[PDB]
Design a protein around this ligand. Structure first.
Ligand SMILES: [Cu+2]
Ligand SMILES: [Cu+2]
Ligand SMILES: [Zn+2]
Ligand SMILES: [Zn+2]
Lengths: 151, 151
């Protein structure tokens, strides 16, 4: 264990739980303890800016848009797998949400370190993540439903 | 990519798809392409013996029991996480099965290598995997539903 990240639903504004971040010899483990999520597989990524506030795009509101794009320190400008290097370092494996709307399945990011995560935002999307920009950009994650700033 | 493992349902005996095994700098990636599985999270582990045949335990039939216990080359005799060392090296992250009964979400095992996998069995269980022997042994995976021998 190490860091505790408070997550909040963007649409409702109410807290949905926390995610514990820990560093180990194989990378960063994300241990979720969230509730009230839509059952299924969800896009899960680290974003650039440390904010969950809404942004604005061509006259339309973007929930959690202030977080910016996917954390991409090497400027790959591509969405990929958590085990591939030529893509966003913030690409995490998808988060599993069971029928009861709970997310407790831990996940690991081999290309990340805890230290570099400080000041960034953890994002959970409505759609899944096929780890590619096609047929849909950013793995088809779609809108941002839950978000939290890494302290 | 590298190896293709044919998976078959133990109860029905009919094929359920394949799992592609590939080696990369971070470990072994398991890319599933399975169908006809019960929606939800499933225990996913590498077992000792290279057989999916049934075994016998105190007069009761054990589907896929010929596969033996979880691959544990260091004899830890404990069930754990894919990123912890003091437990079965065959402990993989859980497999996600969507509502449509399909399993396509790729998963990685940082403690494994392709070469050592040859001759072992890939197992999918009915229950999930909380990566511990409690409250239920072997992460609560329960019975074995799908199995395949690594060539
Ligand atoms: Cu994202
Ligand atoms: Cu098993
Ligand atoms: Zn990305
Ligand atoms: Zn095990």
């Amino acid at each position: 264990q190490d860091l505790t990240v408070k997550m909040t639903d963007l649409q409702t504004g109410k807290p949905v739980g926390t995610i514990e971040l820990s560093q180990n010899k194989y990378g960063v483990v994300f241990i979720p303890e969230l509730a009230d999520l839509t059952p299924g597989i969800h896009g899960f990524h680290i974003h650039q800016n440390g904010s969950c506030a809404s942004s604005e795009k061509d006259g339309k509101v973007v929930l959690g848009g202030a977080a910016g794009g996917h954390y991409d320190p090497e400027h790959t400008n591509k969405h990929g797998f958590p085990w591939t290097d030529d893509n966003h370092k913030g690409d995490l494996p998808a988060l599993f949400v069971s029928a009861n709307g709970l997310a407790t399945n831990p996940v690991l990011a081999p290309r990340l370190t805890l230290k570099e995560l400080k000041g960034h935002a953890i994002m959970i999307h409505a759609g899944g993540d096929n780890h590619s920009d096609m047929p849909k950009a950013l793995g088809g994650g779609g809108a941002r439903v839950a978000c939290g700033v890494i302290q």
